[PDB]
Structure 1
Amino acid sequence: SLTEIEHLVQSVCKSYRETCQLRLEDLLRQRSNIFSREEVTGYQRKSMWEMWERCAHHLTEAIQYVVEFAKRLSGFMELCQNDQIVLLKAGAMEVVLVRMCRAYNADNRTVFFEGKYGGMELFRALGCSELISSIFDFSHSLSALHFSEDEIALYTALVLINAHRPGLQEKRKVEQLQYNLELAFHHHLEKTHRQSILAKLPPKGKLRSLCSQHVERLQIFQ
């Protein structure tokens, strides 16, 4: 089992790398590519309908890679179809929000969007500054940890594989898989001497509440 745990760490980290949408080194190298004043004004002038359509398109692309990530998790495919859809439906966007911190630059408070970095003001046309400021603030706190790609891999696996999600039939089987991934996570943190990030992780509520507030607005504009 101790070998099982290590094989699981390697597998989880491998599945994420194959389904990480953009390479980390590419996001970091693009940080100097910042939307100009003209380009920002262009985005602020678009209709709220234009911005929602572009965001939903990009959030939907991101979700697809999160689905491919789940298909390659060790025990995800051997869960019942009902449970798979419950975990993805409740989890996919939570994982996207966590992945996004890779694309957040805490230096100048910008996120990667449509090929360049821009601030919260890019999204002004949406008319929901509170909601956008929540995404940037959440990303900022996450960025403080300097997550490695493997830490993202293991942590987002635990975001997906949550046995407390309502609507599970094989609750026992998911609680087992979560347990294994919990050990994979705590084990790799031992080996990389990064155990200190555990205390600092987001509360299980916080990711739920924030993602809830966002499916609400996007459902409206769909």
Structure 2
Amino acid sequence: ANLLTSLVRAHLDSGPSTAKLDYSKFQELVLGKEDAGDVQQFYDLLSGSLEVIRKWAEKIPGFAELSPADQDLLLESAFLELFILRLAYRSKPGEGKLIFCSGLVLHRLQCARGFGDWIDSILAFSRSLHSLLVDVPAFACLSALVLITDRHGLQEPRRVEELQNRIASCLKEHVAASCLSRLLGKLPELRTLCTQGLQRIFYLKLEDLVPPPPIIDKIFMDTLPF
């Protein structure tokens, strides 16, 4: 309740006001393979969500009560899933319009060189997500359920499960006020999309036009199970 209110406040504070939106670089008709500028932009757009998602998670009630190690581990493990889910929800797949958490608005063709195919899969997911007409409260719970989840190497797993359970109840409680099971149905498809992001970074690291910035690199390495 106060939980839901807290989760909603943290969500809306973590993104641009419809008025803080910037179309000054938006182009509805532009025209090759990726160059260094496309790869820089890809890393820059990813990097732009790092501090924002960190500050969002600190405002999730209970999140600061977890061990610093479990905090860092949860953030690293969900970063990509969180970037995708939040971009999918904020974006306008009907116009092929990507809206980033800084307020930057770009057409798919303007990011497509950097992201590759993954951008199309993300837009497919955005359309699927948009179709379920998820309200902000539900999404504020969903996004937190993506963060506060079991990962390998948690010190206090029981406490993470506890807090997940609490957020899950706050969500069910709100939805009652199969629809739940279709919301929760989008967490595994989000993990599959996470995989494509790891594939793309792998590929970009191979190609090495521009190296990933240290923090993305660490997320990449620390999130490989092998």
> What's the TM-score bracket when you normalise by the shorter of the two chains?
0.7 to 0.9
Match status 1:125 vs 2:117? no
Q: SS of 1:111's equivalent? A: strand
Pairwise CA distance, 1:184: 0.6
163, 170, 174: which one pairs with 2:156?
Answer: 170
CA distance in 2 between partners of 1:175 and 1:115 (Å): 35
1:85-105 Cα shifts (integer Å, max 9, x gaps): 111001122112111123322
CA distance in 1 between partners of 2:154 and 2:119 (Å): 32
Pairwise CA distance, 1:127: 8.0
Alignment of 1:13-32 (within 5 A): 13-18=8-13, 20-23=14-17, 25-26=18-19
CA distance in 1 between partners of 2:89 and 2:146 (Å): 16
Q: 1:158 to 1:7 in 2, by over 3 A?
A: same
Alignment of 1:8-157 (within 5 A): 8-18=3-13, 20-23=14-17, 25-26=18-19, 35-37=27-29, 40-41=30-31, 47-112=34-99, 115-119=104-108, 121-126=109-114, 128-129=116-117, 131-157=118-144
TM-score (norm 2): 0.77
Q: 1:134 to 1:36 in 2, by over 3 A?
A: closer
Contact 1:52 1:218 in 2 (8 A): no
Q: 1:200 to 1:157 in 2, by over 3 A?
A: closer
- Which amino acid in 1 is paired with 2:16? L
Contact 2:88 2:122 in 1 (8 A): no
Q: How many equivalent pairs are there?
A: 202
- Which amino acid in 1 is paired with 2:39? W
192, 195, 198: which one pairs with 1:215?
Answer: 198
CA distance in 2 between partners of 1:127 and 1:196 (Å): 32
- Cα RMSD over matched residues? 2.7
Q: Which is worse superposed, 68-77 or 55-64? A: 55-64
Q: Which has the higher helix share?
A: 1
Pairwise CA distance, 1:206: 2.2
- Which amino acid in 2 is paired with 1:128? G
1:27-66 Cα shifts (integer Å, max 9, x gaps): 8x889x95142xx23xx68x53211211211221123211
1:191-211 Cα shifts (integer Å, max 9, x gaps): 2xxx72532544443222211
Show structure 2 runs of 5+ residues with no match. Answer: 206-210, 213-226
TM-score (norm 1): 0.78
Contact 2:80 2:194 in 1 (8 A): yes
